[PDB]
């Protein structure tokens, strides 16, 4: 007997109405993806970098290679319109089927059909629904590969000549590389899977994951859980929800770090520079200015005794000085031409900095992902004037908050599933209080 | 009655004076490692180059600190977010100069405290209790992650995590105010409402229950002796307490249901501290407090200062002074 | 460090005197029972 404020728990054992809830809610997601894109396109001005305009969806589309050309310049906005329209129209269909199943359709499915009906305790049926969805997920991953290899390619911030759309012809299949990422430390200079820095590895990993999911999908259709797995889990709808809440939490924490550090699948042309990137770019900017004035930047000793412009990392690499010494693991397309085998190459620095690199550093330094809640760009002490908060801050902060709450919800629902399974979620039986039958501790 | 099953039964026993449990199997060594290293470092560690500028900061008692000024100092900015275990240093001398003990302590402690939370779940299950005390502890735990891990991740360096010291804590919060303006951030404002309201409702509940104790003792004895551990009957009169508090305010601003009352007690500070931990965790990615600097101007365009501009003057003073030898370029971008 | 020399006796009596007070009251409580 749930209260109104826990009312969706009344759906636990109403597979029909629960399906409508899920399908209606899926319409809401697709709706926002369509409405939001159209909102962004309506407000979009192509003369302005995307990251000055508060855009978070258009950059996802452009990253897949639609609408953009060399350098990230937007060449055609019709793909953006299409993506928004089609999502918006589709939400009507999902909305239709969800309110039908929520309101008019069979309340429970298990009488209408044995294929669609399910009991949460039927471990065979549960793993078969799981297996279907695994296969579907695997297909989705292969769609990314199909776009990359067979339908126009993806945007490559690393392409020579300033970035461009590029067809991926040799995706990485070598599992020492693909699974090597999964074994790199999450710490600095390593970055676990967040360090993936080239599209070959991105596409290859999606080949692997698509195969793995389809293989596992077929596995779970064809098997039942082995007894070690039967005795280790709780088998209930709330338990299953709790497992998925934990996985969503983990995934949101990862996405947080992905959009904060990675400038390959979140190109800085579209999302603005990363924090490390902006910091590196400021040191570059004043190195350039000062060297033009005559400064010998390699031999300039700063106040601490460390180089003012250049110093060594703890393992010897020549890096930018000042507080950005913390950011020397940064790698970006505007900076790598200056890197030799020992780090930044003083001869390249003296002779080979190009205007486009000066421009990019000045742009990224002045578009560092710092800003106020009311969208005043810059450090907390800056005056009003610049309306700017980086898309990377918006995406990082939002997904941290969301990930945190879903971990709380995992704990909430996991503890409750355990207690309801053992039968004491409503409280302690006065006549059979366990502690009262235990010996005392002392 | 096999060796493993006996071990499992001791690990999960409810007869142990302190419950161990599976989360305890990880919690105990990690907390002992963190604690033993913390005590030794606080007493005897040599100065640590926290900002990577070869300017070591003395944090331990033997190097001239007292209890208020001492700290275990954060690891060097030269390291940033790199993993710096002992075996990665050429010597202990090196590890100590660069701030290794901080990393050892905070990683073991966060692990141990995460397991502390899980252990609260576990014992509740073994005793047949409801499960969610561990969710109340997720608020402090989230707050510790924020200042020891999340904020260092977003800024790029454990050298900007909170020092393990009393004055180091203050340094942390001053520099945070200059770089973020936590005070003008609504999630910090909700954290204040959470802890102020938490203290308020602590006093309220304590005073209302204490106000309505049933006479069970003489004036020569502590009234606390009117309650016996495990008695079935309540020890105060909730209807009298409600009759007092609902007249103090009005009838419907007072609880008459003890379960709703204690849920409210739980919820208000937990939720406020969730928000303030999320404040720190999102200012980690530099989405800062409201900036109303020069927001008011007159007909001509002269700036008309508000109290926000006065705050900005104080923030500027913290900004220009902190880590005074560590900046070579005009913007303190991390 | 050039600390206040009297800080030591100050700290010592600050600990000792109220602690002794409590111990006296505790022990004579036990020996009633």
């Amino acid at each position: 007997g749930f209260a109104w404020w826990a009312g969706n728990a009344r759906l636990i054992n109403l597979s029909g109405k629960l399906l409508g809830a899920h399908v209606a809610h899926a319409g809401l997601i697709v709706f926002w993806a369509g409405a939001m894109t159209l909102f962004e396109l309506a407000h979009f001005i192509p003369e302005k970098p995307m990251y000055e305009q508060g855009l978070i969806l258009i950059p996802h589309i452009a990253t897949l290679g639609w609408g953009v050309g060399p350098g990230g310049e937007v060449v055609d906005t019709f793909p953006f319109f299409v993506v928004g329209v089609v999502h918006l129209i589709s939400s009507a269909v999902l909305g239709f089927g969800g309110v039908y199943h929520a309101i008019r359709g069979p309340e429970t499915l298990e009488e209408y059909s044995s294929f669609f009906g399910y009991d949460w305790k039927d471990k065979n049926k549960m793993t078969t629904i799981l297996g279907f969805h695994l296969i579907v997920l695997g297909i989705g991953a292969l769609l990314l590969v199909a776009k990359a290899m067979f339908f126009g390619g993806l945007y490559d911030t690393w392409a020579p000549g300033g970035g461009d759309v590029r067809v991926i012809t040799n995706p990485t299949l070598d599992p020492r590389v693909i699974f090597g990422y999964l074994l790199k430390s999450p710490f600095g200079g390593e970055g676990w899977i967040v360090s993936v820095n080239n599209l070959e590895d991105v596409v290859g990993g999606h080949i692997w994951i698509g195969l793995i999911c389809i293989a596992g999908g077929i596995w779970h259709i064809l098997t039942t859980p082995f007894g070690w797995a039967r005795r280790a889990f709780i088998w209930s709808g709330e338990a299953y929800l709790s497992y998925s809440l934990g996985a969503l939490s983990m995934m949101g924490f990862i996405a947080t770090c992905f959009v904060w550090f990675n400038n390959t699948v979140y190109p800085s042309e579209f999302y603005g520079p990363t924090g490390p990137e902006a910091s590196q770019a400021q040191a570059m900017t004043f190195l350039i200015r000062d060297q033009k004035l005559g400064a010998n930047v390699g031999s300039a000793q700063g106040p601490t005794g460390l180089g003012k412009y250049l110093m060594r990392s703890p393992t010897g690499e020549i890096i930018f000085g000042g507080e950005t010494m913390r950011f020397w693991d940064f790698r970006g397309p505007w900076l790598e031409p200056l890197r030799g085998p020992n780090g930044l190459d003083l001869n390249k620095i003296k002779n080979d900095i190009q205007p486009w690199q000066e421009r990019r550093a000045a742009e990224y330094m002045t578009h560092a992902p710092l800003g106020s809640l009311n969208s005043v760009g810059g450090v907390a002490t800056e005056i009003n004037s610049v309306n700017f908060v980086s898309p990377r801050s918006w995406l990082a902060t939002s997904h941290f908050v969301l990930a945190f709450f879903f971990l709380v919800g995992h704990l909430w629902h996991a503890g409750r599933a355990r207690a309801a399974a053992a039968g004491f979620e409503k409280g302690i039986d006065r006549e059979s209080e366990p502690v009262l039958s235990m010996p005392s501790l002392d | 009655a096999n060796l493993w099953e006996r071990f499992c039964n001791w690990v999960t026993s409810t007869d142990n004076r302190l419950y161990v449990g599976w989360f305890g199997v990880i919690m105990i060594p990690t907390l002992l490692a963190a604690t033993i290293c913390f005590v030794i470092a606080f007493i005897a560690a040599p100065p640590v180059d926290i900002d990577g500028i070869r300017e070591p900061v003395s944090g331990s008692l033997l190097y001239g600190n007292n209890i208020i000024t001492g700290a275990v100092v954060p690891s060097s900015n030269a390291i940033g977010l790199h993993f710096y275990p002992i075996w990665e240093a050429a010597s202990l001398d090196e590890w100590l100069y660069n701030g290794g003990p901080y990393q050892l302590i905070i990683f073991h402690f966060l692990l141990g405290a995460s397991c502390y939370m899980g252990r609260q779940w576990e014992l509740s299950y073994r005793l047949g209790m409801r499960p969610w005390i561990c969710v109340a502890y997720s608020a402090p735990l989230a707050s510790a992650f924020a200042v020891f891990l999340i904020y260092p991740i977003g800024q790029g360096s454990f050298s900007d995590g909170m020092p393990l010291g009393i004055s180091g804590t203050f340094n942390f919060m001053i520099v945070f105010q200059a770089e973020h303006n936590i005070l003008m951030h609504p999630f910090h404002q909700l954290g204040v409402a959470g802890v102020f309201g938490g203290a308020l409702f602590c006093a309220m509940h304590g005073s209302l229950v204490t106000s309505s104790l049933i006479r069970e003792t003489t004036e020569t004895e502590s009234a606390n002796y009117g309650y016996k551990f495990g008695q079935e009957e309540e020890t105060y009169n909730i209807v009298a307490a409600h009759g007092y508090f609902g007249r103090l305010i009005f009838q419907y601003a007072s609880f008459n249901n003890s379960r709703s009352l204690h849920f409210f007690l739980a919820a208000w500070p937990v939720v406020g501290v969730w928000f303030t931990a999320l404040g720190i965790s999102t200012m980690a990615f530099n989405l800062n407090g409201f900036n109303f600097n020069h927001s008011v101007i007159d007909a001509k365009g002269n700036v008309i200062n508000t109290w926000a501009d006065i705050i900005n003057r104080a923030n500027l003073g913290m900004e220009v002074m902190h880590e005074r030898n560590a900046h070579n370029f005009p913007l303190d971008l991390a | 460090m050039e600390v206040n020399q009297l800080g030591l006796i100050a700290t010592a009596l600050f600990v000792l005197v109220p602690s002794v007070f409590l111990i006296i009251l505790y022990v004579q409580t036990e020996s009633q029972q």
Binding site: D442 | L61, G230 | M1, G7, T11
Partner: peptide
């Protein structure tokens, strides 16, 4: 001398934790 004093008080507190936990007055039901 100040270092000795700080550490002495800290160690007395740890010792107190030990007695407070293992040598507490036992809670006894009614």
């Amino acid at each position: 001398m100040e270092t000795i004093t700080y550490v002495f008080i800290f160690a007395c507190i740890i010792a107190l934790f030990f007695f407070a936990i293992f040598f507490r007055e036992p809670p006894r039901i009614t």
